[PDB]
Structure 1
Amino acid sequence: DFSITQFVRNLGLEHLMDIFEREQITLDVLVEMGHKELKEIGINAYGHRHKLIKGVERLISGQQGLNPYLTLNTSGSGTILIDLSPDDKEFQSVEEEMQSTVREHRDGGHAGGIFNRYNILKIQKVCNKKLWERYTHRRKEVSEENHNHANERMLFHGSPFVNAIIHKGFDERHAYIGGMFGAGIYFAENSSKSNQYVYGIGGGTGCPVHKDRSCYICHRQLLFCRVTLGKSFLQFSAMKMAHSPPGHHSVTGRPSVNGLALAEYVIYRGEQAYPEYLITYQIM
């Protein structure tokens, strides 16, 4: 609470500090107050309010190159999870999407386990202002190309780094290099295909507690995400690449008799995906 003290003292208005103390006014609060709000807390003289507002202008706009405003706007950022009520139709739509896309993989449940259904424990909306703005800026950019069409999908993602994704967003710097199309972030339209990646590549060693890849006790987590595909490149065979092909925004792997059994979607830029829903579940 010292930056506000220095600011007010430099303005010559130290005798107002008691007011600022009782109202818990910090510098980041003060830089957002006008004549009306300053009058609300008892700064009655016009000269005082005018001096305060001019000081704020000199700090924020006069030294924009130092970005003091970004230094003052740290509070309130971060991710919050909002629980979806099981009786609401949004929860039910998400659960139906999870349940109705389960398939029987070529492996007998080795990577993901042996099951037919899920037991869903909760679903949470992920809210992060900065990540959402990054996503919408990129989505506008993609739709500006591609005749005003973002080509947005909602797709599943399984990863042992879900917490990192939800707090920091998707990142192609952490791409899946071993993927069929190479060095990309991978999403599936089938929930079981993404459940194959909950505990690592090929299932890893299973759950941390029992080291079982078909554990029916430990809570697993999946992501249901908004993915911007734009103009998507259709591919049937493996093709290692570092970025999207020229003139495209993503890659789509289609199932084939001698190739993929289920569809696959790859983006090479983290900002083209946003993790809307976090799903906690057990396999049954």
Structure 2
Amino acid sequence: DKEFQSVEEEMQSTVREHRDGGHAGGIFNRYNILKIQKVCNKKLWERYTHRRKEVSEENHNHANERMLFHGSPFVNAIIHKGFDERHAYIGGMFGAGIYFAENSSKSNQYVYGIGGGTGCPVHKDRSCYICHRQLLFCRVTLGKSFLQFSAMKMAHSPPGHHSVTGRPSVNGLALAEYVIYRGEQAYPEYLITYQIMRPE
């Protein structure tokens, strides 16, 4: 399948060297991709496309949709119930939103919790090469995205906007991040099962 080879290529090509030296997500240059499953949840898809149409109408007939990664210990709940701002990451740089990355390795830092938590449930290892991890590769409606470089604790999108884009800056972010404040603005399209690989 070419659709899944495209997803594997985005997963592999967006890995970056992290400033924390692998503390949160583990030490690796690449992944062993085990499975890529397309999520087909009609009710969530309709909730997503309904909101996408509304955002497009409010953003010069443009949804500003992007495919982005999301890491969480709650990926199974997300696939069944959808993203939910009532469970937003309050401690985030941009406040109470749902965070996405264009770099798979940034999302990998969140798979076992904030700052990687205590790592895998079996070995309590943030750099476990044994346990299988899951990431989501999502359709995200950004609409009119508010560009921000420094911490700005929001409860909702800035007035007239549909999302926040965190841009890299000297004093701030190493890599971009994208924040929505309404769960219906993302669809968990692909579930990726993988392992991080021990460097060569």
TM-aligned CA deviation for residue 258 of structure 1: 1.2
1:265 matched residue in structure 2: 178
Partner Cα separation in structure 2 for residue 143 and residue 117 of structure 1: 36
TM-aligned CA deviation for residue 257 of structure 1: 1.2
Which SS does the other structure have where 1:154 is aligned?
strand
Partner Cα separation in structure 1 for residue 60 and residue 96 of structure 2: 28
TM-aligned CA deviation for residue 121 of structure 1: 0.4
Q: What residue ranges of structure 2 are gaps of 5+ in the alignment?
A: none
TM-aligned CA deviation for residue 138 of structure 1: 0.3
2:155 matched residue in structure 1: 242
TM-aligned CA deviation for residue 105 of structure 1: 0.6
Partner Cα separation in structure 2 for residue 203 and residue 230 of structure 1: 30
Task: Considering fraction of residues, name the structure with more strand.
Answer: 2
TM-aligned CA deviation for residue 162 of structure 1: 0.4
Partner Cα separation in structure 2 for residue 208 and residue 186 of structure 1: 23
Partner Cα separation in structure 2 for residue 128 and residue 94 of structure 1: 19
Cα deviation, 1:211-257, whole Å, max 9, x if unaligned, reads 00000000000000000000000001000010000000000000011
- What do you get for the CA RMSD once the two structures are aligned? 0.4
Partner Cα separation in structure 2 for residue 103 and residue 246 of structure 1: 33
- The alignment of Structure 1 onto Structure 2 pairs a total of residues equal to 197
TM-aligned CA deviation for residue 90 of structure 1: 1.0
Cα deviation, 1:98-121, whole Å, max 9, x if unaligned, reads 000100111111100000100000
Q: What residue ranges of structure 1 are gaps of 5+ in the alignment?
A: 1-87
1:116 matched residue in structure 2: 29
After TM superposition, the score normalised by the length of structure 2 is 0.98
TM-aligned CA deviation for residue 176 of structure 1: 0.3
Which SS does the other structure have where 2:39 is aligned?
strand
Which SS does the other structure have where 1:95 is aligned?
helix
Runs of 4 or more above 4 Å deviation: none
Partner Cα separation in structure 2 for residue 209 and residue 181 of structure 1: 32
Task: Considering fraction of residues, name the structure with more helix.
Answer: 1
TM-aligned CA deviation for residue 91 of structure 1: 1.3
TM-aligned CA deviation for residue 201 of structure 1: 0.4
Partner Cα separation in structure 2 for residue 143 and residue 241 of structure 1: 22
Bigger relative contact order (CA 8 A; separation at least 6) = 2
After TM superposition, the score normalised by the length of structure 1 is 0.69
1:199 matched residue in structure 2: 112
Structure number with greater Rg is 1
Identical residues among aligned pairs (%): 100
Partner Cα separation in structure 2 for residue 144 and residue 101 of structure 1: 31
Partner Cα separation in structure 2 for residue 170 and residue 183 of structure 1: 13
